[PDB]
Amino acid sequence: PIFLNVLEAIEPGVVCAGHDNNQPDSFAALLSSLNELGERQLVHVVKWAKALPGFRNLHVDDQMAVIQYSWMGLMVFAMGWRSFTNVNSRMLYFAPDLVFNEYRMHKSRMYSQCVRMRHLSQEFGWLQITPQEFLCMKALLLFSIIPVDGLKNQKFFDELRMNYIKELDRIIATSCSRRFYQLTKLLDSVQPIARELHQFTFDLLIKSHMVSVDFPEMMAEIISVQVPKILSGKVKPIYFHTQ
Numbered sequence: 607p608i609f610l611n612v613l614e615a616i617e618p619g620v621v622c623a624g625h626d627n628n629q630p631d632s633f634a635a636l637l638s639s640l641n642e643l644g645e646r647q648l649v650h651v652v653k654w655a656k657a658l659p660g661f662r663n664l665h666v667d668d669q670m671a672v673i674q675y676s677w678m679g680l681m682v683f684a685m686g687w688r689s690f691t692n693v694n695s696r697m698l699y700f701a702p703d704l705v706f707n708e709y710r711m712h713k714s715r716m717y718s719q720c721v722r723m724r725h726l727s728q729e730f731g732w733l734q735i736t737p738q739e740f741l742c743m744k745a746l747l748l749f750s751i752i753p754v755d756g757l758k759n760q761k762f763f764d765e766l767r768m769n770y771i772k773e774l775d776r777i778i779a780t781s782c783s784r785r786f787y788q789l790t791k792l793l794d795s796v797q798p799i800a801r802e803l804h805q806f807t808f809d810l811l812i813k814s815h816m817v818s819v820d821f822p823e824m825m826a827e828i829i830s831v832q833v834p835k836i837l838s839g840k841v842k843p844i845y846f847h848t849q
């Protein structure tokens with residue numbers, strides 16, 4: 607299980623948000639902490655991605671683009687997994703020091719988005735997703751959103767995505783057909799959630815001053831340069847099933 611060995615080996619560890627749980631729950635503090643959590647996770651996602659089998663075959667500009675477009679989905683998926691394995695989807699486990707209960711989902715002004723995320727988390731249980739399945743699915747998420755006009759070296763990307771899809775089917779192995787169908791359906795469901803968060807973070811960045819919400823360096827640049835390309839339709843997610 608060479609492929610599975612690698613994915614398990616490179617899987618990022620625990621990342622705290624640095625939230626002061628002693629201070630009252632407020633939109634400002636919660637979102638600021640989420641943004642800081644995102645900055646920290648971004649660092650881990652970059653190291654993880656670059657250590658993925660074949661990732662370095664991609665053109666260098668494509669390497670960063672793929673990461674900059676797929677980070678929302680990747681982080682939402684892993685967070686849903688953490689919520690499943692830690693609190694059985696009861697709450698959203700963003701970090702050990704930033705767990706969202708219903709009250710926080712409301713104060714964050716992202717209640718509808720959190721609902722979709724908790725639903726995603728519940729799916730891990732309803733589908734009995736295995737740790738091994740989780741890992742391959744997460745890897746595939748990195749190769750699930752690109753420029754409609756293509757990447758610098760689209761062929762390298764296509765071969766890479768193909769091989770990761772084949773690995774998912776592999777660990778899966780009538781029954782297998784049902785399983786693959788279900789996991790690809792689950793993967794597709796991540797995209798709508800990611801787009802809602804893209805829209806939300808974009809709007810929040812634009813009015814960040816007014817509501818006292820702080821965005822760290824990497825987050826601000828990516829959200830003002832990359833995210834708009836997605837919201838304007840220049841960059842679109844890759845779906846398995848027709849939407």
Ligand SMILES: C[C@]12CCC(=O)C[C@@H]1CC[C@@H]1[C@@H]2CC[C@]2(C)[C@@H](O)CC[C@@H]12
Nearest residue numbers: 640641643644647681682685700803807
């Ligand atoms: C990706 C993060 C942080 C990592 C995670 O566990 C998932 C979570 C999903 C909501 C994101 C948050 C990062 C900061 C964002 C983008 C806020 O600006 C609004 C939505 C937040």
